[PDB]
Amino acid sequence: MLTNSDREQIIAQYQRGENDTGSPEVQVALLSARINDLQNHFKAHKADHHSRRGLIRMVNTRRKLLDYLKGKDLGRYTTLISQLGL
Amino acid sequence: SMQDTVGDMLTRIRNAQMANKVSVAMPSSKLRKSIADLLVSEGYVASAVVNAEENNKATLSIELKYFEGKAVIETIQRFSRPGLRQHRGKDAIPTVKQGMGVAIVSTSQGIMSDRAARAAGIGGEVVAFVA
Amino acid sequence: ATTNQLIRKGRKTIKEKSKVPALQACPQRRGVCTRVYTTTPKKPNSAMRKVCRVRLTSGYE
RNA sequence: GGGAGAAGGUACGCUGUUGAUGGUGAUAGGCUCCUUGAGCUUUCGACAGUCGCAGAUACCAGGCUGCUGCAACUG
RNA sequence: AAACUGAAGAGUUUGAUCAUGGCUCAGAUUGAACGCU
RNA sequence: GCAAGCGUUAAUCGGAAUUACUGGGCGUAAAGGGAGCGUAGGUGGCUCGAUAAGUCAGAUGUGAAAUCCCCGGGCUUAACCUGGGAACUGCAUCUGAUACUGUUGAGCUAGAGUAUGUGAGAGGAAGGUAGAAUUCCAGGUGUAGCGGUGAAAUGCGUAGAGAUCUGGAGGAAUACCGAUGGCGAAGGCAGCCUUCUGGCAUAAUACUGACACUGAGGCUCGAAAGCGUGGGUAGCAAACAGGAUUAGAUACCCUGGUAGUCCACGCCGUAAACGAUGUCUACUAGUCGUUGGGUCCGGACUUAGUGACGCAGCUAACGCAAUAAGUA
RNA sequence: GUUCACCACGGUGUGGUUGAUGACUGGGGUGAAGUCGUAACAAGGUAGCCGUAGGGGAACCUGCGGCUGGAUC
């Protein structure tokens, strides 16, 4: 998984405001970290379809938040995807 | 999801009237309060008050009427749903129960009765039929 | 059948074909009897009904 | 993968003009480098003319299709 | 002044029933044909 | 009954609400996609403004005449002809209104999410392991049957079976717990342990601020059987062989028995894949169970499921009924 | 007038789409004093049905999984 410590590290890096932990930036960053970490699990467990269902839902949620953020403020979206390599 | 706020309010009134409820409360909006005000002025409901609650919310509470055991609102049907909106001209507004009912019309001069819109020579969205 | 479904797809009235194709939408039609015979009716009835096999000007037999 | 060069078409000589283009490097300028490019040579084209029966003119250099039996094939 | 007036069903699945559902019929129309007159 | 016509045939609409826009349906009559994710599209919370595209109204121009309809007029009447209207639901351009939809600026938190603590679970994937049992192999005891059936027989057994005891090999499944119990989107998922891992439920606070719903195509997953390749192979068992039963018996019953069932990796993409009930919202008497929480004082309330009833309402009826087939 | 350019007819080759016919062959229907059975409806005499596989003169049977639209319990 991701520990509480590195989850809070990601939160702190992408804080738009003080202890917000809810903006599209921090949400997308946390989803990105979780997906990139779960890649390790699914390389060793290819037939884990029940877990892959949740990972696909993570991908879908990140895509929804990225499109919403792009439609809201395009500078923030172009900055966020550049930071996250998307 | 909930995508018909007017239809939700009308269904709340209809279900409470079928359940013989004294009053029905719902989340308030200005359009809902206007429709309730037209119902009060038409005499279909006893009153409608907006109580401003916390968190910038409000509750519209409507007191219902019952005459001779039966509900005063014999029928209340949404006409122009979100999936199919209906707009009519001054001489095209549908009459409800030969005129003994009310067609709620949202015109440019506000939300009024179909007979009021006909008197004003105006048209608009036909939102509901209440009889 | 929602309003959107009706506008996207629509309603379809299939068209019944004529029960008398050999007339070709004519009141009558001329032919030559290629056979004059009799035949027996369906189950309730019994008779020797008089039939003619006729080739019409429309190309049907 | 193929069948396939399936089948079947069209152009093709010479003369003049002309566009592009590869190589090599004289000459100048700053066993080497860069720019420039004389002369020589490569490859595609275009346009105009011209002669004959005939321009891949000689030698050289697949005939091609349809159905069907057998054996998978190279050997 | 007026142009603002308009809406019928029946038969047939069953021992019988209700529903569904097709088929059929009563109307109007025609650049019509045919039969009798 | 029509009548200088009357019937028939052809043809269109009607009746047909029988393609249902007006104006139908999909639990069982035909009809919910196996399930989900999602693209285009459709639809979409609250408050204050802007705009005026949709919308509404007015003006103007046009919408040929004829036809249709209304009021008249002329043929002796009528058909017919004719004057004036009405209409031609339309389009264009300006003007005005801003309730709603569209486009926009700002704000809000109630829909939707995030962080943090606890909890339940046969959710998934990879390994390992345990004990009962079967089968087989090898021995000890022992002797004449075993097995099977409605009865039998085939079969096994005097080359020693079956039974009983002791060792060994191997595969598969996981008794009890066990529960209209739980988890999962469905398909599904039960010994125990570890590793990797998804979702959910729950308390409070903080946060984002409409980020939503649904979804043609598309993709993913998807019982069992089946297919490819390589393993494995105890039991069971299509096919198959035999014995019965029977007129026959390509069956049911019996004795055997190979594929398959198991594993790995790929196909397949179907099921009465069912609740024969698409997803998501809100609202509408109640009563009694049960699973996971939570908060109070053994009870009470509340939550997310999962069941049995039962009003109103709905239904052709059966029945459904807050887990609707009710109201939208 | 000549010549070139454009171009209609006409020609050549190779395909596509489609109609009618075709020995033979497949299923579908209709027809009566037929032949063989008796598969379904009752627990239809082995509950039925669904998917799939194998088998069989034929209705069908058998395995695996599923459903109740199953009696009796």
Automatic annotation (TrEMBL), chain A:
Q: What is the lineage of its organism?
A: Bacteria, Pseudomonadati, Pseudomonadota, Gammaproteobacteria, Moraxellales
Give GO MF terms, alphabetically: rRNA binding; structural constituent of ribosome
What species is given as this protein's source?
Psychrobacter urativorans
The alphabetical list of record keywords is: Ribonucleoprotein, Ribosomal protein, RNA-binding, rRNA-binding
| Function per UniProt | Forms an intersubunit bridge (bridge B4) with the 23S rRNA of the 50S subunit in the ribosome.
Q: Which GO terms describe its biological process?
A: translation
Give the record's GO CC terms: cytosolic small ribosomal subunit
Q: What is this protein called?
A: Small ribosomal subunit protein uS15
Q: How does it assemble?
A: Part of the 30S ribosomal subunit. Forms a bridge to the 50S subunit in the 70S ribosome, contacting the 23S rRNA.
Among Gene3D superfamilies, the record links this protein to: 6.10.250.3130, S15/NS1, RNA-binding
Report the Pfam families cross-referenced here.
Ribosomal_S15
Entries under InterPro entries matching the protein? Ribosomal_uS15, Ribosomal_uS15_bac-type, uS15_NS1_RNA-bd_sf
Tell me which domain of life the UniProt entry assigns to the organism this sequence originates from.
Answer: Bacteria
Q: Which family does it belong to?
A: Belongs to the universal ribosomal protein uS15 family.
UniProtKB/TrEMBL annotation, chain B:
Q: Which InterPro entries does the annotation name?
A: Ribosomal_uS8, Ribosomal_uS8_CS, Ribosomal_uS8_sf
A GO cellular component annotated for this chain's UniProt record is: ribosome
What would you give as a GO molecular function for this chain, any one?
A: structural constituent of ribosome
* Alphabetically ordered keywords of this record: Ribonucleoprotein, Ribosomal protein, RNA-binding, rRNA-binding
| Superkingdom as given in the UniProt entry | Bacteria
GO BP terms: namely: translation
Q: From the record, what ranges are coiled-coil?
A: none
Q: Does the keyword rRNA-binding apply?
A: yes
Q: Spell out the Pfam families in the cross-references.
A: Ribosomal_S8
Q: Which family does it belong to?
A: Belongs to the universal ribosomal protein uS8 family.
Q: What does this protein do?
A: One of the primary rRNA binding proteins, it binds directly to 16S rRNA central domain where it helps coordinate assembly of the platform of the 30S subunit.
Q: How does it assemble?
A: Part of the 30S ribosomal subunit. Contacts proteins S5 and S12.
| Name of the protein described by the UniProt record | Small ribosomal subunit protein uS8
Lineage, broadest ranks? Bacteria, Pseudomonadati, Pseudomonadota, Gammaproteobacteria, Moraxellales
From TrEMBL, chain C:
Protein origin, superkingdom:
Bacteria
Entry function: With S4 and S5 plays an important role in translational accuracy. Interacts with and stabilizes bases of the 16S rRNA that are involved in tRNA selection in the A site and with the mRNA backbone. Located at the interface of the 30S and 50S subunits, it traverses the body of the 30S subunit contacting proteins on the other side and probably holding the rRNA structure together. The combined cluster of proteins S8, S12 and S17 appears to hold together the shoulder and platform of the 30S subunit.
Q: Which family does it belong to?
A: Belongs to the universal ribosomal protein uS12 family.
| Subunit record text | Part of the 30S ribosomal subunit. Contacts proteins S8 and S17. May interact with IF1 in the 30S initiation complex.
Q: What is this protein called?
A: Small ribosomal subunit protein uS12
Tell me the organism: Psychrobacter urativorans
Kindly list the organism's lineage.
Bacteria, Pseudomonadati, Pseudomonadota, Gammaproteobacteria, Moraxellales
